[PDB]
Write a protein that binds this DNA or RNA. Structure first.
Lengths: 353, 253, 253, 252
DNA sequence: TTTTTTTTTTATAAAAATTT
DNA sequence: ATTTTAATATTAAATTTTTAATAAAAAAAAA
DNA sequence: AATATTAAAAT
């Protein structure tokens, strides 16, 4: 949630951001933040001003979106790991209080729009009113267990556990749309993972190594750059935008140098600015153990999927049935090797003007 | 850059073989020859296409050019050429326009085709030069037939070599399959024979959809050289008529 | 335990490409006398009776009455794996539910063993009597296929009439009348294309069209159609499989 | 009427040419010959069929019958007929049916086919004979190759007629084709030669799609007369079996 | 036997709907 | 002057099934 | 948790 990092790497070091197809990640075990996906499915998949629900009044749009998107991860060749979110750290209290103030403001203008009596304004202000719940992640972990996708529970924010999973070499990419996963230390980030029917969206893949080679920084230095840019664990200095942050991290090579030489009349350093604790959080978070988890893609249980999704969620049997048959087709394709395993990439550019 | 190809049906067959596997590729055009080391969009297969300058007619290349050609549009442009057509490649200094002049055999229909280019970057793999432990030389129609009929009943071949010969075994939900071949050193034939050099009796599982994409080069070479060893990817060499090779690489399952 | 080595690969390819259009699952009544099949249409209108006697096989040896049934879309695809001049060898076991389909090459180069899943189905083995018919014609099979596929463009029904000077095919459809007034052809110089009619009584009643278009996919089996009918009875479209047997299709009118 | 034709493949090729372009056709058949003059289904092109009564072996037209046939249906009815078939066209005055009694070429199968006529407005456009400046007489194989292979690039063909060679230029997003044809006079059998009439260099664009339905009449003749001027819609003339012409007109 | 020549069948890219 | 930046607003989808249209073959029709 | 933008800064 770093303010202006995607545009920063797009406009400073564009050799790191390589746009790729969804088909080009065949046989790649990748780690996906689950709560960002759940918010995508309970925001995007709506009818008539309402979330997609069953006849019992339970929310089931997240299970719908998770099932179809995760199947689309299977035919494109990639192997998903759904790192679910855990307890956020104690420095995120201001950010979650700001989120709760935003949702309460959206609730009061939702009540104002319902007093005025619209439809699109009401569906927008309840699209902003979306919250993950323990039963939401519980039912999605249940669904990915029956599909055979390896669910993981982070003890921190799941971008950190995704970064620790790619850092151990267990998975190829941390496939979150969040900027904070690069600062948590993912060597590969990839964004915009809408694996869809003929969308042809390029997967915005962020590689940390070409960032730290092109910007002339190391890992703690990029942490200090993102803290000065503005994370979700501490505030930023007012008046310091992206390009000034790039210049200050490039010409002082610390953040305590920016503390010790700056004018307080013009650029106000905050007195409650707890940058060292968020720096140590981005260096050493409370991640899961990457070498003790079960990263396996088992056979999908057809029968409990039909019983769960047709007794509790009353989904139509033909769509999820054909989805699990093409899951079976993609699982026979899942053992297929990649040619990067046998040949090393030497001509990385092969430029054509 | 001026490359006049007298047998332009060769280039028509090359881009028909390149049509379905990949859609965009970067041509490593140098003075030694026209090259194309391109990899699949699913990043599993690879195309090593090499057309040397000794197999062209009056080849010229000043700079080390490299242009990125939409191969579906190049296949649509090269399908305008005839069977006995003389195709003249031409390009400028900048990667903007690739001229494809189709000189008629009886000089009555000169067909100038300027082609719009793309500016994309593709990944090159460093392929080592090693001795494969199982070199299988096969007729091209039989390898085409084996791939297109085992793909009906299977998702993957299990290519097993032995003293007797290669064994294209496929398995599926439709019924179990098996195609066995045998080498013949007795008939001493030229194109319809199977030549199998063995070191190890290798048994590797290859995806058969990509082998169907590979068997589109069958018109380019009656001799198909399947060279493989244990846990090293299959190279499927279609030796073009005295210009070079169209080598197809494929990762085992 | 069962061996059905048959010398002509193309003609069992013709049988299994003839029967893929009508019927999905058929029970192959395999006995010691010869290979039989009898099943009703997938729309449950038509009836197909295939007989392949063991005299026209190359070698034949069957022990038990194997009334086992395959999917014919599956066996159709497995027989499109065959070559045209291949040698079909249907093999089977007793405990194993696999119909082996070893296809020998015309040379001694390759073998094409295909096991097959037996999707066993219990059809009703009914005994159709072979009585006399009021109209029997011997018309050429490509010409009957032309009549069926070229009156398919007008209506939904064929009104076959038994005129004395040749058989008349009509179709009152949306585009108009379609009366082929085909003539009596008992010429000596046409050996099998002569329209040989042995009629004891004229008859004319409305037949089907979509099923006749399904029937004429048996066209490359024989050059003749021994088409038979009478009053208030199913049609016979008999196709003589070389010297092996008859593929009688039946049509409810 | 009654019009026997022993080269029924010519009428089959006429109807398979005219099936995909136009759908409602007013076969204004007179005693001077079969002719048809109707526009496109989208009223952009124009078809001018002429089948003179001297080319048919048997002809009989007592009354000027202007009837209207859906050419998809008549195309299916002529798709029934064989290649060497003797196709007759018959009509009765009082009942609106067009009988098409075919003849297999062994006198052993007679195929009778009635066609349901339908009443519609008879087109009476007409065209004066313009001074066609640039007349290009190419073979139909290269014209079908040029239109079918310039449709792969663009949607418009800029035909640049000149003194020595005619250029067919199409430029779309996939590139820029430019097909030149030299005025061949040395290696020919008087059917493979491209000859261009010297009046003036003529350069104006014509769209594709409709020119592909124009060159769908490729098996009718081995010659395409391409008569054009600087403003006039071009004549794409197909010589029908040296007994008539099939003229095509396309507004640039 | 070799090569065209088409309907068919095909995965296809746009676009409607709603998938609950 | 620019361009820098913290404000202010906004969205986050994926089918199956139809719509006209596609281009690669199925599968003959004819050199 | 993302993108755009424009008055308002921001020297």
């Amino acid at each position: 949630g770093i303010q202006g990092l995607a545009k920063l790497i797009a406009d400073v070091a564009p050799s790191a951001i390589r746009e790729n197809d969804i088909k080009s990640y065949f046989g790649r075990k990748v780690a996906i933040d689950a709560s960002m996906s759940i918010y995508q499915f309970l925001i995007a998949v709506r009818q008539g001003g309402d979330v997609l629900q069953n006849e019992e009044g339970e929310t089931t749009s997240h299970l719908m979106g998770m099932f179809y998107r995760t199947i689309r991860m299977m035919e494109n060749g990639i192997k998903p790991v759904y790192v679910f979110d855990g307890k956020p750290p104690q420095l995120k209290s201001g950010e979650l209080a700001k989120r709760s103030e935003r949702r309460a403001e959206a609730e009061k203008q939702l009540q104002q729009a319902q007093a005025a009596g619209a439809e699109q304004e009401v569906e927008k202000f309840t699209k902003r009113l979306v919250k993950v719940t323990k039963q939401h992640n519980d039912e999605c972990k249940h669904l990915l267990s029956l599909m055979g996708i390896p669910y993981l529970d982070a003890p921190s924010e799941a971008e950190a556990s995704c970064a620790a999973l790619v850092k151990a070499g267990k998975v190829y990419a941390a496939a979150t749309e969040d900027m904070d996963c690069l600062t948590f230390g993912s060597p590969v980030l990839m964004r915009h993972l809408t694996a869809s029917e003929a969308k042809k969206l390029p997967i915005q893949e962020f590689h940390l190594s070409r960032i730290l080679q092109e910007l002339g920084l190391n890992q703690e230095q990029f942490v200090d750059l993102c803290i000065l840019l503005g994370s979700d664990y501490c505030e930023s200095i007012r008046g310091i935008g992206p390009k000034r942050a790039v210049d200050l991290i490039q010409k002082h090579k610390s953040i305590e140098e920016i503390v010790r030489r700056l004018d307080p009349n013009k650029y106000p350093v905050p007195e409650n600015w707890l940058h060292k604790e968020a720096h140590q959080l981005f260096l050493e978070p409370e991640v899961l153990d990457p070498e003790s988890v079960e990263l396996k893609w088992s056979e999908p249980n057809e029968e409990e999927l039909i019983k769960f999704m047709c007794g509790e969620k009353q989904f139509s049997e033909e769509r999820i049935r054909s989805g699990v048959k093409r899951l079976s087709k993609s699982r026979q394709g899942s053992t297929q090797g990649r040619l990067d395993d046998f040949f090393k990439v030497t001509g990385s550019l092969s430029s054509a003007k | 850059f001026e490359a006049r190809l007298v047998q332009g049906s060769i280039l028509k067959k090359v881009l028909e073989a390149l049509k379905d596997l990949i859609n965009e590729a970067c041509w490593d055009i140098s003075s030694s020859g026209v090259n194309l080391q391109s990899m699949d969009s699913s990043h599993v297969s690879l195309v090593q296409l090499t057309l040397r300058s000794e197999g062209f007619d009056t080849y010229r290349c000043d700079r080390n050019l490299a242009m990125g050609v939409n191969l579906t549009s190049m296949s649509k442009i090269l399908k305008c050429a005839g069977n006995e057509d003389i195709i003249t490649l031409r390009a400028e200094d900048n990667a903007d326009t690739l001229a494809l002049v189709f000189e008629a055999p009886n000089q009555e229909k000169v067909s100038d085709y300027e082609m719009k280019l793309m500016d994309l970057d593709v990944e090159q793999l460093g392929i080592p030069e090693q001795e494969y432990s199982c070199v299988v030389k096969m007729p091209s129609g039989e390898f085409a037939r084996i791939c297109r009929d085992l793909s009906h009943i299977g998702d993957a071949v299990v290519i097993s070599c032995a003293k007797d010969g290669v064994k294209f075994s496929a398995s599926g939900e439709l019924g179990n399959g098996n195609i066995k071949l045998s080498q013949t050193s007795n008939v001493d034939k030229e194109e319809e024979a199977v030549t199998i050099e063995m070191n190890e009796p290798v048994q590797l599982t290859f995806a058969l959809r990509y082998l169907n994409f590979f068997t589109k080069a069958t018109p380019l070479s009656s001799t198909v050289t399947l060279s493989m060893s244990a846990d090293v990817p299959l190279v499927v060499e279609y030796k073009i008529a005295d210009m070079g090779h169209l080598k197809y690489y494929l990762a085992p399952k």
